[PDB]
């Protein structure tokens, strides 16, 4: 549009579709906050020539509330005004930046609880009498192989990011828990042939250790990210 005025105030409007690029840090995936932005500036006119300023700072940008992304949610947007220096001069700049936050509830059920259920299942091995070796060896092998398969396929399904994430840390932790439980029983088997007192001792000791250690690990994990 072009809109003139009696005092000479021109008004120029466009309708643009921009595929802008913002940098996303995924070290905290999927519990992260994204800061994607849009930077605007003049190009041929130095700061001694043209001045940018938002008109109606409170109402500079409208229609943000009605925006609803399928996966994210618009928390807050801020406005900035700067002067940038390049090699040729000082050019003005305006910025628009709004945070992005993920819907964790869509990922909890689909990713985390399988490994949690497998880890809890690995605990039932301690409740079986130590005389029945098969009932515990089968559980150990099944839980380790299940953690392996879930880790592999969950890693393959997530989008392609060539650097380390946090869900990988949690999967590694759960894998370490179940693998150490398996090695715990593997050592109890060897020491039971020597003497049953030490075997039953270490069995009940691990029984009273592992739940507390797991709860502590989960509390430490979830307090630092959330």
């Amino acid at each position: 549009m072009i809109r003139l005025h009696p005092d000479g105030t021109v008004l120029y409007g466009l309708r643009i579709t921009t595929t802008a690029a913002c940098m996303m840090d995924l070290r905290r995936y999927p519990l992260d906050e994204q800061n994607c932005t849009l930077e605007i500036e003049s190009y041929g006119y130095t700061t001694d020539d043209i001045e940018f300023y938002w008109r109606g700072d409170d109402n500079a940008v409208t229609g943000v509330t009605k925006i609803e992304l399928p996966q994210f949610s618009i928390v807050d947007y801020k406005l900035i005004t700067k002067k940038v220096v390049f090699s040729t001069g000082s050019y003005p700049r305006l910025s628009l930046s709004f945070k992005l936050k993920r819907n964790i509830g869509y990922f909890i059920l689909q990713t985390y609880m399988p490994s949690i259920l497998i880890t809890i299942l690995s605990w039932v091995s301690f409740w079986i009498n130590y005389d029945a070796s098969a009932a515990r060896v089968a559980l150990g092998i099944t839980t380790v192989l299940t953690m392996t398969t879930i880790n592999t396929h969950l890693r393959e399904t997530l989008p392609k990011i060539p650097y380390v994430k946090a869900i990988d840390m949690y999967l590694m932790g759960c894998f370490v828990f179940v693998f150490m439980a398996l090695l715990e029983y593997a050592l109890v088997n060897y020491i039971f042939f020597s003497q049953p007192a030490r075997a039953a001792a270490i069995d009940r000791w691990s029984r009273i250790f592992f739940p507390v250690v797991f709860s502590f690990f989960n509390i430490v994990y979830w307090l630092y990210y959330v």
Binding site: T152, E156, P162, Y163, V164, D168
Partner: protein, 140 residues
Amino acid sequence: STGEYVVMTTHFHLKRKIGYFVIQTYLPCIMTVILSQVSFWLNRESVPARTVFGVTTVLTMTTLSISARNSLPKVAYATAMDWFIAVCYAFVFSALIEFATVNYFTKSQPARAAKIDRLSRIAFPLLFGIFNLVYWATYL
């Protein structure tokens, strides 16, 4: 074809980060090869258990190799990861052939299978360790 032109050249240097491909494919392949040792330490009578074990190792190796070679383009020569994958592969199928021949030899005489296990248990892990020694030293 026309004449002598003038060319300005700029070289942007680059280096690939290795922090990812270690914990992505190399470390899982090492862990699976080391895990495949358990088949030898099991009883020589149990066919189904060790067959399950070998099938597990084979399926994991194949599903690893597919994505490993998918992430990288298709060139004529073999990359410095194809050799590592092929060594994982050769060791796991050598263990499989060893199991297959022990399953046949254990019937006639048990001492033969006992000696085969007593040799392999020390032969295979030492060779894999020596191969890691030869591999990781050169490239760095």
